[PDB]
Automatic annotation (TrEMBL):
This is Cellulase. Residues 2-41 form the CBM10 domain. The chain holds residues 20 to 65 of 410 of the full protein. Disulfide bonds join C3-C12, C13-C38. Belongs to the glycosyl hydrolase 45 (cellulase K) family. The lineage of its organism: Eukaryota, Fungi, Fungi incertae sedis, Chytridiomycota, Chytridiomycota incertae sedis. It comes from the Eukaryota.
């Protein structure tokens, strides 16, 4: 549990080691799914 995107108010990508990152910003890397932005965190998914 470390969704860094939460700081701004974004969701979290399920399984970060398997979600092709489509986003990329100072928030790290993200993934797009269902047409919604999610924060990809290596510590997330715990």
């Amino acid at each position: 549990a470390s969704c860094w995107a939460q700081s701004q108010g974004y969701n979290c990508c399920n399984n970060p080691s398997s979600t092709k990152v489509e986003y990329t910003d100072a928030s790290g890397q993200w993934g797009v799914q269902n047409g919604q932005w999610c924060g990809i965190d290596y510590s997330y998914g715990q």
